[PDB]
Design a protein around this ligand. Structure first.
Ligand SMILES: *[C@@H]1O[C@H](CO)[C@@H](O)[C@H](O)[C@H]1NC(C)=O
Ligand SMILES: *[C@@H]1O[C@H](CO)[C@@H](O)[C@H](O)[C@H]1NC(C)=O
Ligand SMILES: *[C@@H]1O[C@H](CO)[C@@H](O)[C@H](O)[C@H]1NC(C)=O
Ligand SMILES: *[C@@H]1O[C@H](CO)[C@@H](O)[C@H](O)[C@H]1NC(C)=O
Ligand SMILES: [Zn+2]
Length: 696
């Protein structure tokens, strides 16, 4: 009575190899499920993290290399362009012989980099305004510094686009780094050293004299300014309520409420916005509505920006852009970035050039690369099997509403309405394979030169930003996918109320049409429930069935949501991570993902029990003394096997909205009675605490 198929054999071998059966599952299910994987594996020198997800992504890059590196006679133009882009990227000889010349050509167009410019004040500081300098980086290169203005979806009218104003992203991974002490000290040192090294290279290439003390002076003031910006930004915990974050006002009101004096000139918000929007021939008057996400930031900015000159600001502004471009330059320039990445992420080697290039082409031509990927690597008939599993789990979500005791009836009815409305996107959009005209037209305005990698990447920057700006007066395309197909991930879009399962994640261990259903439900089923539950977490619950930010909760039910989810805030905030030197997880910043994990696993498990009821027990797996309820949880845990470099562990505690895999495993299983039943865990053993958190 044992499954002896090839697909059961490959699954069982993977399960056996990764687990450590000498650990008791009720004491540490992470080491039980992953201890064998941890023993066999070391983090690659090129990675700051390693594990199941990272391995599948590495294996996906291999497929990408295979399809991009050989031209074929039948290739449509969209495909010719992806392969040409790839070839331009991996030609290090062409890149190396240009040195930094492609950046030197570019710098005048952004008002220069003062530290690497002689007589900057005379050349650029003469006509320099904050309106023009910020807008130029924004509109031409998509780089948003000091004031982050972007065109996006209106949270309260999800079919329209609207201009937003927000705080900018920083050079270091989070605002916490700018304390620059203890665990952040080496990163801060490496960051300013990075600045200095790139300034030195540019000056050396321009044949300017190198004054090390003056380099240190100017770049430490860049850091001093950015420390102020960082401290003025709101924390993630003060941005996690989308009802509070949304503030719509007119441009007239913005001028009245957020005045700025920069380089001694009164900042004209209308002139700044028009410097950007004129790029795509759109005129803006002072009655324009604008969603301001960071009003407090703009307020604290006022005393900051009176203290700095045009030259101080431009040294930061140009550096933030140059930082993003160094990896498209010669090996000498990359060597300065390699040094900063080591200090920051703990890697000791740069990622293989072909891998970086494959990922770059994938990120910029997601539909063309997706077509090549699915034709080489994706079954196709599995699209329908996954369809049916989503059907089952969505229904499990709706049925569970009845049993929840902390919602009232009106709110349950609105929750059911939203769940029924979720659109699902599985695998890939069929027309990337069958509609050559549409695919070619997506890249029609791009033309790549095979010896001009830098020119090619600048073209992608311009083309993407101009396309985004042009959406201001257009409706949202409901047919658009929020991810390419060649992606090992899954997503939920609150604005579109849509779950997406790219083909890259529809493979073992998550899913195979020939592996045991216990594994599929513990793998892709739990992921399906995770993404559905995102529509109902501390962010998604605020958006209705059409993706509009509208309150559909009664006061009591909303209050009870907060009560139930507070349990998980304490639970995960109490986890100490050794890899991060004992620092605690942020239970607030990871709450949404933790809610999705705990809700998703329960929905998947109940769907699997339904499956057993309607179909009977599955054949056991050879070589494993586990029943299928145990295998369900074993496979769920093995999805998250992995480990982290110390440097990246402290990074991810501040920047990752997810818990680390090993606490996703321990936390959710601690909260699951069904897990402790499956493994006969004694009361109050580590994996089975008496107090258990439950939202969905
Ligand atoms: C790389 O570019 C150089 C300069 O154009 C060219 O001579 C060489 O053939 C290219 N190499 C490949 C493999 O295309
Ligand atoms: C950050 O700014 C706040 C007010 O915005 C101020 O109270 C605090 O001292 C600043 N922090 C540092 C490190 O300067
Ligand atoms: C913005 O103001 C500058 C003066 O600093 C002016 O030269 C420019 O034409 C204005 N641009 C727009 C789009 O209003
Ligand atoms: C740990 O849990 C206790 C009680 O459950 C809670 O009061 C405390 O705030 C938690 N600690 C953190 C850092 O979340
Ligand atoms: Zn998630």
């Amino acid at each position: 009575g044992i499954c002896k198929s090839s697909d059961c054999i490959k699954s069982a071998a993977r399960l056996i190899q990764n687990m450590d059966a000498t650990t008791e599952p009720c004491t540490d299910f992470f080491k039980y499920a992953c201890g064998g994987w941890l023993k066999r594996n070391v983090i690659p020198e090129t990675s700051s993290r390693y594990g199941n997800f990272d391995i599948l992504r590495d294996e996906l890059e291999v497929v990408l290399k295979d399809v991009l590196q050989e031209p074929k006679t039948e290739d449509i133009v969209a495909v010719q362009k992806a392969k040409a882009l790839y070839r331009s990227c991996i030609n290090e000889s062409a890149i190396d012989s240009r040195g930094g010349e492609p950046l030197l050509k570019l710098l005048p167009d952004i008002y220069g980099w003062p530290v690497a410019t002689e007589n900057w004040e005379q050349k650029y500081g003469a006509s320099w305004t904050a309106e023009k300098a910020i807008a130029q980086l924004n509109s031409k290169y998509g780089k948003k510094v000091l004031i982050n203005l972007f065109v996006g979806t209106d949270d309260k009218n999800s079919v329209n686009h609207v201009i937003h104003i927000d705080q900018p992203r920083l050079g270091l991974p989070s605002r916490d780094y700018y304390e620059c002490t203890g665990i952040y000290k080496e990163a801060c040192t490496a960051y300013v050293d990075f600045m200095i090294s790139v300034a030195r290279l540019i000056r050396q290439e321009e044949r300017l004299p190198i004054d090390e003390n003056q380099l240190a002076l100017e770049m430490n003031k860049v850091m001093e300014l950015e420390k102020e910006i960082a401290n003025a930004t709101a924390k993630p915990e003060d941005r996690n309520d989308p009802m509070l974050l949304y503030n719509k006002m007119t441009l007239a009101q913005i001028q009245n409420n957020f005045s700025l004096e920069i380089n001694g000139k009164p900042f004209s918000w209308l002139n700044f916005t028009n410097e950007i929007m004129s790029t795509v021939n759109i005129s803006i008057t002072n009655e324009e509505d604008v969603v301001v996400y960071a009003p407090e930031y703009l307020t604290k900015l006022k005393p900051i920006l009176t203290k700095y000159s045009a030259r101080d600001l431009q040294n930061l502004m140009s550096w933030r852009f140059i930082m993003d471009l160094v990896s498209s330059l010669s090996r000498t320039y990359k060597e300065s970035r390699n040094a900063f990445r080591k200090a920051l992420y703990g890697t000791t080697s740069e990622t293989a050039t072909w891998r970086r290039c494959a990922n770059y082409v994938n990120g910029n031509m997601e539909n063309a690369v997706g077509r090549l990927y699915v034709e080489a690597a994706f079954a196709g008939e599995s699209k329908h099997v996954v369809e049916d599993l989503i059907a089952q789990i969505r229904e499990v979500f709706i049925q569970t509403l009845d049993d929840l005791t902390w919602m009232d009836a009106e709110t349950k009815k609105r929750a059911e309405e939203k769940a029924l409305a979720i659109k699902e996107r599985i695998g890939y959009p069929d027309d990337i394979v069958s509609n050559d005209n549409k695919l070619n037209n997506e890249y029609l305005e791009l033309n790549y030169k095979e010896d001009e990698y830098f020119e090619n990447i600048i073209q992608n920057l311009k083309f993407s930003q101009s396309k985004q700006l042009k959406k201001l007066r257009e409706k949202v395309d409901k047919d658009e996918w929020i991810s390419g197909a060649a992606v090992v991930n899954a997503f939920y879009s609150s604005g579109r109320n849509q779950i997406v399962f790219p083909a890259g994640i529809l493979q073992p261990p998550f899913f195979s049409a020939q592996q045991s259903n216990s594994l599929n439900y513990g793998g892709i089923g739990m992921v399906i429930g995770h993404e559905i539950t995102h529509g109902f977490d501390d962010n998604g619950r605020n958006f209705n069935k059409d993706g509009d930010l509208v309150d559909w909760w009664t006061q009591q039910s909303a209050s009870n949501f907060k009560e139930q989810s507070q349990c998980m805030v304490y639970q995960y905030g109490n986890f100490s991570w050794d890899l991060a030197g004992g620092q605690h997880l942020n239970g607030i910043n990871t709450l949404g993902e933790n809610i999705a994990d705990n809700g998703g696993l329960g929905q998947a498990y109940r769907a699997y029990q339904n499956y057993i009821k309607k179909n009977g027990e599955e054949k056991l797996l050879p070589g494993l003394d586990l029943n299928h309820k145990q295998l369900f949880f074993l496979n769920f845990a093995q999805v998250w096997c992995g480990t982290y470099r110390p440097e990246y562990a402290v990074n991810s505690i501040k920047t990752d909205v997810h818990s680390p895999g090993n606490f996703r495993i321990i936390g959710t299983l601690q909260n699951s009675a069904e897990f402790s039943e499956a493994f006969h865990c004694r009361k109050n053993s580590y994996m089975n605490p008496e107090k258990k958190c439950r939202v969905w």
